[model samples]
Target: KLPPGPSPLPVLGNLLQMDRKGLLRSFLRLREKYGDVFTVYLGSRPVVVLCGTDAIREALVDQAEAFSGRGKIAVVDPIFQGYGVIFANGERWRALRRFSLATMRDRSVEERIQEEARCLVEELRKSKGALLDNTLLFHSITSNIICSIVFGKRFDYKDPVFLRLLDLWFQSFSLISSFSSQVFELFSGFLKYFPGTHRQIYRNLQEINTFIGQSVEKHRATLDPSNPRDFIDVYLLRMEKDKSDPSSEFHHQNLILTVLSLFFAGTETTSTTLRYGFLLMLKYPHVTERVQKEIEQVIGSHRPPALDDRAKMPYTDAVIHEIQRLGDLIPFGVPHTVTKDTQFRGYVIPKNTEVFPVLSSALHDPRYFETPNTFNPGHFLDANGALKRNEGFMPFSLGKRICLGEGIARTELFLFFTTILQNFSIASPVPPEDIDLTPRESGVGNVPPSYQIRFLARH
Candidate 1:
């Protein structure tokens, strides 16, 4: 039998009990009532929700192999169609994931990030301490970094074509987080006949796919086996090697979808965290002041923040971790599934059951964190002011299915965040106490309230 949960209503199942926009809070409420591991349904699909650190760790880490399969994000499944790394399970997933990991792990993208940080500072300097809505600016900065890695170049910030692409990317992303999207996830079959953002998302996806396809063609025409230019070139070379194998996962379709997923996945999460982090800084001027002092003490104002400086700046490090923890992006997590029938935490989960390792559950697990509800860098800092590691902090999720972008995301987060602070003293219009830090929306992720801040150049 599946792990116990509240009786789910037919068709709609337990979705009626969930807060569409506040999915994480709903899961927490259910977790408290049902214990760590419980089964919930989205329509007819039974998903085993793993709450708390123990259940998440045991399933995702201890029994990693059985729980490593990718589960359906029904809304995105049409776009991904089990062709890319994020949605594909079994052999195809293994092959594509292994290749992508090998390619990305051999990364030298830090300079690109550091360079982008400088460009960002220069752009913010253009603002001259005026209030600016930099939502798209933040997106461009992070998106370009991922683009450079995947496509071997970044777009000019003001380029019309690039800006158009950014709109499509952000728009599609925004739609996925809507309450309509959540309902569609549960009742996609029934809703397919109806109209919504899902249709717009499909249109945006096709447009983005076309863009990726063009890049692939360009990469193919100039391919050099000895020296691959970027992800596309490297992938093309692999496709060449696997052309003889009828079942090889390295093909143009997989490449297109994988690149698309990586671009979207890589671009959104880190940028959102930085936006939320800066918002927190504006809300808590004391925290901002303390971090600036650390920047002064460690790296000083003479130079931009390098990846190495992260080690010496313990307080800043903890602050970044805390922001990511409090930000709680990817709260529901990218869903996982059982590769086979499995026994976990005194229950048998049948093969291919979609599982949610509630990431916020672990990050906010009170057993490990002293102040689970409040924003406290002390949660990640020791008494001596050194960085303290918290096992519950799994911003990138955990175990085998951990984010492939974890390494790059960490480097980007540290560099982009600190470098911005090093260059400017941020300010909100309202008093520090009044600047609300409550998230503006929760579309499968928490997004900070859209507010502009002035950037006063420090040096």
Candidate 2:
């Protein structure tokens, strides 16, 4: 009734219309043909596709509270569980969220967080600007960031326990799109009766659970109410303090899940973005040179660059924002459920309707960004060279359920990235045409496919 869409057949709805792998690409193409807001069907469920700045502005921003709910996807539910921050809803989400924001506020601004980034820079220096696959390297660095926050101490690069956790984290992401993952998602209820792909998912979940459990136990043995060092320490302290309150969502289950959520949310997204950032810098040498020039002229090599340096380095900061905007690493904004039946732009969005804002659309919208297809850093800068914030910039989503690690991620992206670029020039091993920007299935999140590069250090 609202927008023109392919008519569906009975029983299947539009299930046979397209494969899930290319659904996003197809949707973007449809947006070009149709207007910003269109309707599609997913097995009898009405799906509203919102594209462009105006549609997203209307739905995600102007009507934020109405769209703040988390979608209970079949695949995501068992993986994250209701205990975690990303999946938890209502009052439970609110309480845990308040605690997390407060805790992170107290933790991130301290000298320890800067020390953590310095530790990462040390690790990056060990690569010595040789050709290296940054996938694992970035993962290790970001994982260590989360580890230091949650475990009170960072793990060594060769630490088998920590490596195992990284292995599971990366592997689980790959498994999400596997044939097995698809079958399990379609037949979630059958997981109880027949365990095939679902069994494997459980196995992966157990590996992470066991890894986090060990840390939880280690913290429990040595916890001091007088001194809370990391996330787990503070969470346990709160659970004890709030034991009598039934409303408190700080039990061991939620505690462990919340820790996992921090690791999941904090590590991969920032690392992947950084990886693509370096790749983009290499592919577009002119942009790279301009960013380096800005850094050299403004921040200079006399001192280490901090997140605050973003103010002095407009081109570099714009380049980073453009990288996030252009790369569209997380193409689909984190899916949110309709908490209650709501209306967006004269359409009824039923309760529990999964809203998937096309984040890539806004990032590449011709209306908002000039030369949307090209890698232009000036999109985030003004004529006066001041950093401009665009309302369409929803890399870390928005509202109450916005990314918990936004500050931490921003700090990591700026400090780690500028530190690397300050020392080396990034480039691919092969020609520019050989580089692939095509999206791959990145488990729950989206990331660039594996690629290598040569990093020539500046003397």
Candidate 3:
């Protein structure tokens, strides 16, 4: 009746069997026994885990609408309470998703992203090949894109207030991507009664809400419905229009949390990817060398890399795609549920039953990739060196709940990535051959290993 899996015991369920540090290890073992789709209990709660491309694509793509429902992310469910864009489901989620996608896609932020890329290059230029921790530098540009979109402005790289906001994001990533967090997610029902790091994550969300509250206040005071300057202003207009409707999803709380969710997501995913990309570049200098050549031939140094140049630079484009694939930042795609009672394969997924699509399975699937473990851009490139399309390789999940910021994030990754390689030859203080590209933390999210790199400006 239920998906086959190893037996669970008491409140611990299968927690005792899980490799806390490497959950994918547990999944790999379970898959060997239970096949691609298996059940795992977080305490008494049951979740179906979908692995590899066959099950994952079949669930997320073949039945996109049926599987578009967002399952509760137990770790942060208290904070979101299923209100904002990412965590919310049903008609409210539908409206929020539509409005958000519309607002983000309605205008191009190419200039904003390019300007931040230029700003980031200037910051790296000051390092003069000295050792530097690039996390904040990367976070600044990535967050600034969201800031410009949401706040309608960019902060100076050193601005204290902006730095503090980024600090919240910093603290959050460290907290959420912890082994303890995974445990908490498993036992939040009971764990919520006691004190833990999840409490810290809660407080961080409160602080972010306060920050957005002030910004929302300012936006409301100065908002002109006809002329929206930023996400906040645009949202304010929606709130006013929807005030007349008692069932409107656009409200003050949704505004604050949605803004918070946007900033949290917009900053964390891109910055992490960028941080990991540079680390991988250090790991594979030969790849870097090829990418730099592609950048030079296509983009040159006179101007920063733009959205238009990605198409002309296949090797560089493939490298960026590879970084995402190998990086596997969000290895387990966001949890999804069947929108209605549906039959998938031989199994029946009752409506809203939680399903985990193991994106890493597809990412490192042996069938699709020749050398799944290694850093190989050839996976993305055809014999003619054109970017080969692999639908399953999308880092953002497929279907209705695909990352809302996918458009902006891709732009940020391309511009910041190509721009940096265009102007700088990045190197680690350690030998390139010795640099590690593995994750520091691999809980629900994969955090890139921390390292320092020296940027040598191209003459």
Reference-based TM-score of each model: 0.97, 0.91, 0.97
lDDT of each: 0.86, 0.74, 0.84
Q: Which residue runs does candidate 3 get wrong by more than 4 Å?
A: none
Candidate 1 per-residue lDDT, tens place, 304-381, comes to: 788999999999999999999999988889889899999987899999989988888888899989998889999999
- Per-residue alpha-carbon lDDT of candidate 3 for residues 288-378, written as tens digits (9 for 90 to 100): 9998888888877797778999889899889888888888988787788778988878777778788889898888888888899998999
lDDT of 2 at 60: 67
Q: What lDDT tens digits, residue by residue, belong to model 2 across residues 1-459? A: 355566766545555654556556656766766677776665555667778777876776788788778865555467577777878888888888888888777745435546655666576677777778878778888887888888877777778877877887867655654545544543456454775655565677678878889889989899888999878888888889898988778898888788888876787678888888877776778888887888888779767776677787877878888888877766657667778887767767777776777777788878778888887777888999888978767787666567788877777888877777777777777677667776556334566767888667677
Name the candidate, 1 or 2, with the larger TM-score value: 1
**Which residue pairs come into collision in candidate 1?**
177-443
Q: With candidate 3 superimposed using the best TM-score fit, by how many Å does residue 49's alpha carbon deviate from the native?
A: 0.4
- The top-ranked prediction according to lDDT is 1
Provide the lDDT at 143 for model 3.
80
Roughly what TM-score does model 3 have, to 2 decimal places?
Answer: 0.97
